[PDB]
């Protein structure tokens, strides 16, 4: 008849804050507005004149559409972050499908642009360069692959009502949902980070190697642009994937699990999601408006 | 009530030393679901400290049943 | 206390996701039972009602699987 006492076997209760909520709302609204304006301007510049529509123009059009759809979906995500998912199951499914489809499409389009530049520079004089005039079919295939890879979100998502937390547009795959979610996370980290990252690194490394050996007067600017693109992609996507892998390891008990680490991982996940959302706004500047053609077009249109 | 994009179990480990039910005042049982793969039993102690019991261990069922029976009276 | 009124319409236990029991004491007079259902609603159940007692036992037995 002795009190059992407490020896760290206590429920780990999550910590809630409201400043982060207001900051998240402001950041999401700013990102929404910037992405909308930039993507609309890119689309208008490309579509105003049908003269000189090259492969890069098609790629940029597809990328702009993807980013515009992502930004258009953002506001409901911001509201959900504010007060959890109150909008119902059907909207959860549809919005998640749109968001993930556009995310996959954007990443794969960046990879395709990298391959296009590799072919256009490294193999400029060879006969392989002629194989880059299949932009329409390649873009259609990328969109189809994104739609295929986004199916699990559509099929296995609904509204989950928990006790410690507000309702969430989560996945409900049964009593064993955690393991299936961990497995399904393999697709975003393989066809979303690792494969595009390797393709981009290979292509841009060889492109830089060829450029450094040339004697043109414009080598420096192209090299700086390539470095900026690669660093932007890394800064945007590496932290989120690193934190996701850390969470996956923590759940599997490969790394020790404690309340402090869980709270830190949640905070890092939120911060890294906010950080990675900036790609929809930074793509138009990095890929489209850093070129003379688009700037001249923008100047001409305003006449 | 906050919001999170990762749902986790509420108990990391469980108390293992059997103890008399007289020290229990409040009980909570959470069925397994999307949030956690195992049922969770959390009990308040006499002094206010909270504990996580093992849902499948033998003595836990006895203790929970005795507490509920006594409270129901 | 944490409960005021209790539902008077019995419902199938299959919707009960979470259960909580608070014994009477200095804080209140009658033991309180709070159930969180699949649809997000929170209900307070009177321990003295037979249907409440049966539902609690059914939920407890199911949760032990």
Swiss-Prot record, chain A:
Q: Which residues form a coiled coil?
A: none
Residues on the membrane's Cytoplasmic side span 49-57, 116-136, 205-224
- Top-rank taxon, per record: Eukaryota
Q: Which residues cross the membrane?
A: 22-48, 58-78, 94-115, 137-156, 182-204, 225-246, 268-288
Location relative to the cell:
Cell membrane
PTM details? Phosphorylated upon ligand binding; which is required for desensitization. (Microbial infection) Proteolytically cleaved by Staphylococcus aureus staphopain A/SspP. This cleavage inhibits CXCR2-dependent neutrophil activation and chemotaxis.
Q: Where is this site: (Microbial infection) Cleavage?
A: 8-9
Which cysteines form disulfides? Answer: 92-169
- Which molecular function GO terms apply here? C-C chemokine binding; C-C chemokine receptor activity; C-X-C chemokine receptor activity; G protein-coupled receptor activity; interleukin-8 binding; interleukin-8 receptor activity
BP term (GO), one: negative regulation of apoptotic process
Arranged from A to Z, the UniProt key words for this protein are:
Cell membrane, Chemotaxis, Disulfide bond, G-protein coupled receptor, Glycoprotein, Membrane, Phosphoprotein, Receptor, Transducer, Transmembrane, Transmembrane helix
A GO CC term assigned to this protein in UniProt: cell surface
Chain ranges sitting on the Extracellular side read: 79-93, 157-181, 247-267
Main localization, broad class: membrane
**Its membrane topology, per UniProt?**
Multi-pass membrane protein
Family according to the record: Belongs to the G-protein coupled receptor 1 family.
| Its job | Receptor for interleukin-8 which is a powerful neutrophil chemotactic factor. Binding of IL-8 to the receptor causes activation of neutrophils. This response is mediated via a G-protein that activates a phosphatidylinositol-calcium second messenger system. Binds to IL-8 with high affinity. Also binds with high affinity to CXCL3, GRO/MGSA and NAP-2.
Query: Could you say which disease the record links this protein to?
Result: WHIM syndrome 2: An autosomal recessive form of WHIM syndrome, a primary immunodeficiency disorder characterized by warts, hypogammaglobulinemia, infections, and myelokathexis. Myelokathexis is a unique form of non-cyclic severe congenital neutropenia caused by accumulation of mature and degenerating neutrophils in the bone marrow. Monocytopenia and lymphopenia, especially B lymphopenia, also commonly occur.
Subunit description: Interacts with IL8. Interacts with GNAI2.
Recorded protein name is C-X-C chemokine receptor type 2
| UniProt organism field | Homo sapiens
Q: Which start and end residues of the full protein are shown?
A: 28 to 330 of 360
UniProtKB/Swiss-Prot annotation, chain C:
List cystine links: 1-28, 3-44
Domain of life according to the entry: Eukaryota
The impact of changing residue 58 to A is:
Decreases heparin-binding activity. Impairs heparin-binding activity and leukocyte transendothelial migration
Changing residue 62 to A: reported impact? Impairs heparin-binding activity and leukocyte transendothelial migration
Q: For this UniProt entry, which segments traverse the membrane?
A: none
Q: What is the protein name given in its UniProt record?
A: IL-8(9-77)
What organism does this protein naturally occur in? Homo sapiens (Human)
Q: Which residues of the full protein are shown?
A: 34 to 98 of 99
């Amino acid at each position: 008849t002795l009190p059992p006492f407490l020896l760290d076997a206590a429920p780990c209760e999550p910590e809630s804050l409201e400043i982060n909520k207001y900051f998240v709302v402001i950041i999401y609204a700013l990102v929404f507005l910037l992405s909308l304006l930039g993507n609309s301007l890119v689309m208008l510049v490309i579509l105003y004149s049908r003269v000189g529509r090259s492969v890069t123009d098609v790629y940029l059009l597809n990328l702009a559409l993807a980013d515009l759809l992502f930004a258009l979906t953002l506001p409901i995500w911001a509201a959900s972050k504010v007060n959890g998912w109150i909008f119902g199951t059907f909207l959860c499914k549809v919005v998640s499908l749109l968001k993930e489809v556009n995310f996959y499409s954007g990443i794969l389009l960046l990879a395709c642009i990298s391959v296009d530049r590799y072919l256009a520079i490294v193999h400029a004089t060879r006969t392989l360069t002629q194989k880059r005039y299949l932009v329409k079919f390649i873009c259609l295939s990328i969109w189809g692959l994104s739609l295929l890879l986004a199916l699990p979100v559509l099929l296995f998502r609904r509204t989950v009502y928990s006790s410690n937390v507000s309702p969430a547009c989560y996945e409900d795959m049964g009593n064993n949902t955690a393991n299936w979610r961990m497995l399904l996370r393999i697709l975003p980290q393989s066809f979303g980070f690792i494969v595009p990252l390797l393709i981009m690194l290979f292509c841009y490394g060889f492109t830089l190697r060829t450029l450094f050996k040339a004697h043109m007067g414009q080598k420096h600017r192209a090299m700086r642009v390539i470095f900026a693109v690669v660093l932007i992609f890394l800064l945007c996507w590496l932290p989120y994937n690193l934190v996701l892998l850390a969470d996956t390891l923590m759940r599997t008990q490969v790394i020790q699990e404690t309340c402090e680490r869980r709270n830190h991982i949640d905070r890092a996940l939120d911060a890294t999601e906010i950080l990675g959302i900036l790609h929809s706004c930074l793509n138009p500047l990095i890929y489209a408006f850093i070129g003379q053609k688009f700037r001249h077009g923008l100047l001409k249109i305003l006449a | 009530p906050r919001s999170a994009k990762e749902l986790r179990c509420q108990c990391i480990k469980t108390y293992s030393k059997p103890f008399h039910p007289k020290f229990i005042k409040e009980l909570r049982v959470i069925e397994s679901g999307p949030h956690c793969a195992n049922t969770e039993i959390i009990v308040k102690l006499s002094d206010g400290r909270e504990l996580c019991l093992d849902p499948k261990e033998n003595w836990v069922q006895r203790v929970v049943e005795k507490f509920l029976k006594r409270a129901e009276n």
